[PDB]
Write a protein that binds this DNA or RNA. Structure first.
Lengths: 167, 127, 106, 175, 197, 61
RNA sequence: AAAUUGUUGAAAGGGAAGGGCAUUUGAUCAGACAUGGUGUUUUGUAUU
RNA sequence: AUACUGCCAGCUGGGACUGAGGACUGCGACGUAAGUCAAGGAUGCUGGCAUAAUGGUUAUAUGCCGCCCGUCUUGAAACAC
RNA sequence: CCUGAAAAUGGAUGGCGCUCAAGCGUGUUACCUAUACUCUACCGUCAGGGUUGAUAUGAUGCCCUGACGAGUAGGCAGGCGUGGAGGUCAGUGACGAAGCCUAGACCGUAAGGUCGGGUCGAACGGCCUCUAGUGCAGAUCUUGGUGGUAGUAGCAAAUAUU
RNA sequence: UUGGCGGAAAGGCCUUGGGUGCUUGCUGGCGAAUUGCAAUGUCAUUUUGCGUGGGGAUAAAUCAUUUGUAUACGACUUAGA
């Protein structure tokens, strides 16, 4: 015998997980976040893009759409921490966002077999984007220069300090 | 794979090389506590090597575990490997260095048929 | 614009040290235009990335990043301590770190 | 015959070996290191100039307390010598290597000394006699000169989802 | 914010400027010092002359060549003062001094670029009035500097060149401010005024 | 750093198990360690301690 | 076998070299899970 | 009134580090109750990668530290051996 | 504060320097950081305990709670390794044992153990015990060998060779 | 491109005129999306090494021989088509 023996064999069984007293209470947002405000995206594809905050999803994310006809940011969800809220807001009593939810953003049911080793916007997404943007653009035209403001990107110039900046 | 275990940390990874083992070739690499009256290692000065302590002892729940999470068990023949058939999840078989190449193939064939994980499947293969 | 800086820069001054002992685990970051610790309280928790040009492509890119975050203020001069996933190489004393504005508090 | 660390092929190489050669090992190593990596013809002419003092073997490692010379300025060092015994042992081996190369059927024009190596052979004891009747070793340093001559000669792109989306983004945006 | 900042030396103190400079070098900012011969030292002129002669007294006894190089140029006496405020013996310190360039007068290309002062180290702001101050140019002159006059006869050339620059620059500032004043009192200008600009 | 009033990591000074290897003796101790732990009668506790004793500590009666 | 030496290759070097804490850079190395797996009509019913 | 000092079983916001245990007991709160719970230790969701990416070894560089070991000794790097 | 106040290598508030100080006196706060204190995790020791009516590998085991942990001379305990002995694994092995090398991997806090790769050729291991000529860096240690010094000192009395 | 000025390390600055791209000074119209909730998400600046296609030029030094203003050896100083 190369190795004599283990006398005390550990039991193969898995011990049951202790009961967890950690419920999922609903997430509060920062008081500066009001549906209809103009956020400033900070992370990801659309950094520096002004957007419009529409609905707080149950995914603890934010459903934003800076009007696609203006800045090109689609109906997409972002994280409430990677966005800077601003004092400016736009009226949103004319846009319907009830149908928006998590599985409307369900990307693709990926399995370990449907993996592409080497390396088409849904018509439903575009039409549902249009009926939203019609309400955003229609409201946004009352305030002057905000369409230009929303179109342009945001950047930290030289010599201005974000710790003492008010957005 | 292996049964659930806490994230294994060694709490010290650099080997405790003997003092001056680099300086003098005669001084072997294996650790020997320096027991001199003037030894800086013994006196535990700042900026010198760390001597082994009992504090460095690994977690008792994760002792003698390979990173894969299996305890190394060194098997040589078929019957000793038959001992682990009901303990695939916790033990991994290592064929001894003196097992012939023609004798490893029956062990490897038997181990894969019993689900036993072998950590040296490529040992002494002929190709 | 000509400036795409969504972050604010900082200098990796030094390791957290005593007179004759340093701790490479904790780095000190000096922010531009920041003087008082109360003002630097806006930068607590912000993510810090140290960006350096590597030798060869590592992930389809010649660049590499070491991530971190401001953990606490340090002194009265606005220097803030930063903890990094992997500590700074100690060659970047006085180098430039990028300090983004997320996780945004405002 | 288990030669040194060679980076060539036995097909396009020829070799010569010399063992227990009663020559100054330190002088031989410098001679070998001098011609190391040269084509045979020019190296052979090099050594002829060394006997006739037209050129000097540069002593680069074993060079302490030896006098300076003007002929070392060719090799960039101020210390060079003309070791007659070491050279004649080397060119004797170069001629052996050239004959071996011809026997194996190798091109004469492209033949160069790819690998040359000197090793300390067992040293023959003798007996000097010092002041106050003390005996000390007075021993040689033979060389195991070996050399081989050879003819001359003349990944997966992984990307992230963000990266792969980016590599597709810049293609489609600038057409 | 500048990639490199050019510090004027007129009205500064050797010590107080050096410490500010030495900290900013290690922090990474690149600094070039100009007009080092206009530096000041707190203490009457003759007192510093003794303080330098006591320093020049320190020579490696057995081989004076390899001893402390007692530089006399105002750039290098300031350079010496800044060394020791930085751990120049290590790689980090050596890289710091590499980012440092101290000059006499204002050699190009730094002549045509914005000079900067350190308010924190100025002779006016930091010395109680009536205290005797020592000009570094006069100190270097005595202790062995042989170019005090030539840099002077050339600074006169540069100063009149810069004076003619400000003549045409002040003319443009009159022009642009007059345009701004004329373009002021306008509906746009008033709306910026109440705006904050 | 604590002011150690008493010695630290000092052993109780009493036998915890029979130093003897006698397998049958360890059976008796095994039984009485059960009895002493599972009965509040001091008899089992005292007899258990007396079983640990050495040869000179157990003089013939 | 080591001392010691040669060659090749790699690396570094401003009055030492060597070591510790930490990381960069370079070189090199094991692990995943891709589990018999919530089954799925066997081409005269053991590939899910 | 306010300052100062003090108190709150007052609220609230931000930041850092940690997730040890592995069925149940227990103390307790809110609930008429059913039950839930921030109540005897972390869960839920999402994403990327699935390999040198993280990590290890080693070499080098940098920041700081590091005197040459044995012994005699009150005292060793010792110009003590 | 000044004179009193003079020592011999060059030189010392640690250095740079510092003059409403970066000096002296004093006070306020803010701030920095020890292997100190607090909290958590882990290691170990100790202590006090829980754990056997068909129920757990059948207890030097497992577990819980708590406190601590510096250390020379020295003491004790648990262990690792070496030569050999009894038993056992119906152990390994010429398809390759031992050995040796390995900035190759893993385990152990460590003594060390294991595996992979290369050379290699004939025996050798694990565990329970027994036994000892059993563990080396030192002893101006012994023997053997090899270095830097170093292609150096030197190979210059006896007139002298071509 | 007219010229100039700049010698402290000038290697930079200023101007005339013209062409050229853009122009957010104002109003429009079309595209952005799948990087799937972040992963700096790469844009700079030195040095070369292979080649594209033009420009431009067409040697010295050392050894060896020799001289001695030099000289331990180097070195120095000479001469030699």
């Amino acid at each position: 015998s190369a190795q004599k023996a283990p006398k005390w064999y550990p039991s193969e069984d898995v011990a049951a997980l202790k009961k967890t007293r950690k419920a999922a209470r609903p997430q509060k947002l920062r008081a500066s976040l009001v549906p209809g405000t103009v956020l400033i995206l900070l992370a990801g594809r659309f950094r520096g893009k002004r957007v419009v905050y529409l609905k707080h999803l149950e995914d603890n994310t934010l459903l934003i759409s800076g009007p696609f006809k203006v800045n090109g940011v689609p109906l997409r969800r972002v994280n409430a921490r990677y966005v800077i809220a601003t004092s400016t807001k736009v009226s949103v009593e004319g846009v319907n966002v009830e149908k928006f939810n998590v599985e409307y953003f369900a990307k693709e049911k990926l399995t370990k077999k449907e993996k592409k080793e080497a390396k088409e916007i849904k018509a439903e997404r575009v039409e549902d984007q249009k009926v939203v943007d019609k309400a955003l653009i229609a409201e946004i035209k009352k305030t002057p220069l905000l369409k230009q403001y929303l179109s342009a990107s945001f950047s930290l110039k030289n010599g201005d300090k974000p710790h003492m900046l008010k957005f | 794979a292996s049964l659930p275990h806490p994230k294994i940390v060694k709490k010290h990874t650099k080997k405790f090389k003997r003092h001056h083992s680099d300086r003098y070739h005669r001084v072997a690499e294996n650790w020997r506590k320096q027991k001199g009256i003037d030894s800086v290692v013994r006196r535990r000065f700042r900026g010198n090597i760390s001597q082994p302590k009992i504090g460095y002892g690994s977690n008792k729940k994760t002792k003698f575990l390979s990173p894969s999470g299996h305890k190394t068990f060194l098997v040589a023949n078929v019957k000793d490997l038959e001992t682990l058939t009901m303990h695939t999840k916790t033990y991994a078989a290592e064929i001894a260095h003196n097992i012939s190449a023609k004798n490893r193939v029956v062990i490897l064939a038997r181990a894969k048929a019993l689900g036993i994980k072998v950590t040296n499947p490529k040992g002494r293969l002929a190709l | 614009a000509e400036s795409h800086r969504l972050y604010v820069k900082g200098k990796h001054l030094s390791y957290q040290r005593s007179k004759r002992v340093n701790n490479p685990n904790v780095s000190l970051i000096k922010i531009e235009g920041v003087a008082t610790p109360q003002d630097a309280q806006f930068y607590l928790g912000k993510r810090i990335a140290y960006v350096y040009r590597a030798s060869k492509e590592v992930r389809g890119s010649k660049i590499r990043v070491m991530w971190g975050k401001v953990t606490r203020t340090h002194g009265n001069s606005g220097v803030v301590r930063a903890t990094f996933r992997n500590n700074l190489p100690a060659k970047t004393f006085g180098a430039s770190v990028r300090i983004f504005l997320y996780p945004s508090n405002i | 015959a288990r030669y040194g660390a060679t980076s060539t092929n036995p097909a396009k190489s020829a070799s010569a070996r010399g063992s227990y050669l009663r020559v100054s090992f330190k002088n031989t190593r410098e001679t070998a290191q001098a011609i190391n990596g040269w084509e045979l013809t020019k190296a052979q002419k090099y050594l002829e100039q060394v006997l006739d003092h037209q050129r000097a073997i540069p002593f680069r490692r074993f060079n302490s307390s030896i006098g300076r010379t003007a002929q070392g300025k060719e090799f960039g060092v101020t210390k060079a010598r003309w070791p007659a015994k070491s050279v004649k042992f080397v060119q004797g081996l170069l001629q052996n290597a050239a004959a071996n190369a011809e026997a194996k059927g190798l091109d004469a024009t492209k033949l160069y000394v790819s690998h040359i190596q000197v090793n300390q052979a067992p040293k023959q004891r003798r007996r000097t006699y010092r002041a106050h009747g003390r005996i000390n070793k007075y021993e040689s340093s033979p060389s195991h000169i070996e050399l081989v001559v050879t003819e001359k000669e003349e990944k997966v792109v992984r990307l992230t989802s963000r990266q792969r989306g980016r590599i597709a983004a810049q293609k489609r945006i600038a057409a | 914010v500048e990639p490199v900042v050019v510090i004027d030396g007129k009205g500064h103190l050797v010590g107080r400027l050096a410490s500010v400079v030495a900290k900013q070098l290690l922090n990474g900012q690149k600094i070039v010092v100009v007009r080092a011969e206009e530096l000041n030292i707190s203490g009457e002129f003759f007192r510093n002359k003794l303080k330098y002669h006591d320093f020049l007294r320190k020579a490696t006894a057995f081989n004076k060549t390899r001893g402390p190089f007692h530089f006399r140029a105002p750039s290098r006496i300031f350079y010496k003062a800044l060394r020791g405020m930085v751990s120049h013996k290590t790689a980090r310190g050596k890289a710091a001094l590499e980012r440092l360039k101290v000059f006499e007068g204002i050699p190009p290309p730094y002549d045509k670029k914005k000079r900067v002062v350190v308010p924190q180290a100025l002779r006016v702001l930091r010395l109680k009035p009536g205290r005797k101050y020592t000009t570094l140019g006069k100190l270097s002159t005595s202790v062995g500097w042989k170019y005090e006059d030539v840099v002077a006869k050339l600074e006169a050339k540069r100063k009149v060149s810069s004076a003619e620059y400000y003549a045409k620059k002040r003319a443009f500032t009159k022009k642009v401010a007059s345009a701004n004043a004329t373009a002021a009192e306008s509906d746009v200008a008033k709306q910026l005024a109440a705006l904050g600009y | 750093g604590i002011d150690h009033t008493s010695k630290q990591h000092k052993r109780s000074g009493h036998r915890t198990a029979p130093k003897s290897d006698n397998v049958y003796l360890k059976l008796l101790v095994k039984l009485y360690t059960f009895l002493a732990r599972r009965t509040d009668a001091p008899f089992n506790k005292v007899v258990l301690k007396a079983l640990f004793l050495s040869k000179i500590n157990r003089p013939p009666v």
